[PDB]
């Protein structure tokens, strides 16, 4: 069994074309990337305080 990774054709109606035009002109997926980085900024870092803390063996 296999699957296609990039074999979807975009829809070509009024609403979908307007969705893509708004995504083009208003940078919505760039805003999603900014949101992902902003969400990572408010997560506790995985850093340990070496040498006072040590990696597990």
């Amino acid at each position: 069994t296999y699957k296609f990774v990039n074999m979807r054709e975009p829809s070509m109606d009024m609403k979908s074309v307007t969705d893509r035009a708004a995504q083009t002109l208003l940078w919505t997926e760039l805003v999603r990337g900014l949101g992902m980085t902003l969400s990572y900024l408010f997560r506790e870092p995985a850093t340990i305080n070496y040498p006072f803390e040590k990696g597990p063996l």
Binding site: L30, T37, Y40, L41, A46, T47
Partner: protein
Amino acid sequence: MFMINILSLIIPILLAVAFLTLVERKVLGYMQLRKGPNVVGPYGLLQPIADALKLVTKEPLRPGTSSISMFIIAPILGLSLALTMWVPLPMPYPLINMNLGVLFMLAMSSLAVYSILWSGWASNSKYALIGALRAVAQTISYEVTLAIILLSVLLMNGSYTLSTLITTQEHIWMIFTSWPLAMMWFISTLAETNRAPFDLTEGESELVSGFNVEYAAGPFAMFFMAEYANIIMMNAFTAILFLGASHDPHTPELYTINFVLKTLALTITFLWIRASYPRFRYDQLMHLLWKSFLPLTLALCMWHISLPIMTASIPPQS
């Protein structure tokens, strides 16, 4: 007393640059699930000092094939322009109050392109020159949109006086009136300071460090200070242009607090772009500017000339 004013403008700006290095490193670290500087001083607060001290005691290798006159003139021009860009800024009252303040900024920032054209040429190496030429072409191409966007926005101001921007934005931000021009202006400012996906002249994974390969220690440090001063200055210009703060003539400290907070927010956004996107190709950003930004900018300049006339909303020229 005016000399003290000049000094108390310049020195805090350089300190703000020094700690902007730390702030950028920490923001990048926390967006990347790490910490960043937290060992050298409390929360890395002495790290900029460590960097500045290490740099000025490191051997500044000058190239054997370098015209030293321009090799040292380029950092002087860069830092002098980066500092003098703050003298007309209306933190409530400017150091220098001109009729044509934003025109003055446009001219001074257009003179800053020489520091790359002279550093790349002076460094020789026959390859950093190509990176310098790419940087100069990018800079001059985005100067077009900077100038036209500034022109269109100022048609509500009525003059080139920056103090008038405070009056123009008394009841409403200029963002609510020109947000498309605000996005294009912000990306143009991103591109002019060689930041974010527009950092082609110093692509860490494209050309190592481009025009700054041969510079080391001290002159490299001053170039860095010039770039970060330009970053903070451009964000201050953006805040004053689009997010005008309310002014109390009897309490200008409120305006200063407002302006500083908004400038810091825009600078943190500049560092936010750095941590979120891949890098544009040179031809790709040139295509963006010339075929995407420029037509919309021309159309919006047309719109913003038509709009005050057809609504009887032309501002005063005084």
